[PDB]
Amino acid sequence: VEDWDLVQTLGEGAYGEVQLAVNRVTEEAVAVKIVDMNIKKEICINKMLNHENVVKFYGHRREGNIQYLFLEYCSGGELFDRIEPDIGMPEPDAQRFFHQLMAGVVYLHGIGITHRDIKPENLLLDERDNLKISDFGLATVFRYNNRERLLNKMCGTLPYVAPELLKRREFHAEPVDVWSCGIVLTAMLAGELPWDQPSDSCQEYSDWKEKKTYLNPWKKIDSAPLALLHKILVENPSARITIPDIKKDRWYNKPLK
Numbered sequence: 001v002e003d004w005d006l007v008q009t010l011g012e013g014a015y016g017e018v019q020l021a022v023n024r025v026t027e028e029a030v031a032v033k034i035v036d037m038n039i040k041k042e043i044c045i046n047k048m049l050n051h052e053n054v055v056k057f058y059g060h061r062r063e064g065n066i067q068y069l070f071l072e073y074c075s076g077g078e079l080f081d082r083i084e085p086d087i088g089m090p091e092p093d094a095q096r097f098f099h100q101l102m103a104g105v106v107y108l109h110g111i112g113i114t115h116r117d118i119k120p121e122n123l124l125l126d127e128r129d130n131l132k133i134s135d136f137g138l139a140t141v142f143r144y145n146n147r148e149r150l151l152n153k154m155c156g157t158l159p160y161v162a163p164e165l166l167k168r169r170e171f172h173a174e175p176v177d178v179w180s181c182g183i184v185l186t187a188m189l190a191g192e193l194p195w196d197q198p199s200d201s202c203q204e205y206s207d208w209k210e211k212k213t214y215l216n217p218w219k220k221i222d223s224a225p226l227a228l229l230h231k232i233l234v235e236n237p238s239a240r241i242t243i244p245d246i247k248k249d250r251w252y253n254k255p256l257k
């Protein structure tokens, strides 16, 4: 029962690959992340995580240069692949995935962890299309012994990143994750990213601050989810909506399909 057949390749990453592995006896699947050993922290963070919208960590094995992490298998693949270019997806599915993303993110924040790289490539779908947050490689602790520390390393992926992280030496962790979730929502409902980065050097970002919502991607989005996006994609992180308030939003609580 301790033996696993590496069946299929799942994902190349920078540092590794991810293999479907199946158990010889039980036929259980796992995803196996394989790296030429950042990683100490990733394992350490994963060890603290236990939630239905976070990819389960099963364990690790040293093997000299090669680090193995054994991770929950999500047969649905990446949310990224459910987003049709230029269209997105049906609004009820976007809503359900967003509900689950917030559940995952609430959980992480409640234990003082920030993911710092939320995007569709990192949101996995299990067999019943349940969304799971993956890839704790950029994640870090922002609250410890009930004291918040401010972040100052710039980490993430530029189209998903909050504007305060390009402009401020220090910033709060939670609003940043909130922002990226908003860019994820936008992608789900429009099938495109609104900007390369949230700077006034990008015209699409200037246009959004000038409320030009008759332009794309905003014109493809119904008025109710767009009103939520108006509260999330707010340049000042202190005025940006918080998760407890997202859970009170009208579209968030709209019955759909």
Ligand SMILES: CN(C)CC(C)(C)COc1ccc2[nH]c(-c3cc(NC(=O)c4cnn(Cc5ccccc5)c4)c[nH]c3=O)cc2c1
Residues within 6 Å of the ligand: 009, 010, 011, 012, 013, 014, 015, 016, 017, 018, 031, 033, 034, 035, 055, 071, 072, 073, 074, 075, 076, 077, 078, 081, 124, 134, 135, 136, 137
């Ligand atoms: C492109 N596609 C049309 C090709 C096709 C093969 C159809 C992809 O379809 C699937 C289907 C199911 C999948 N499941 C997984 C998976 C991925 C992870 N990954 C992670 O948890 C993690 C942790 N860190 N990273 C990024 C990384 C990876 C390697 C090295 C460094 C960083 C990823 C954990 N569990 C999974 O189950 C990927 C995956 C892909």
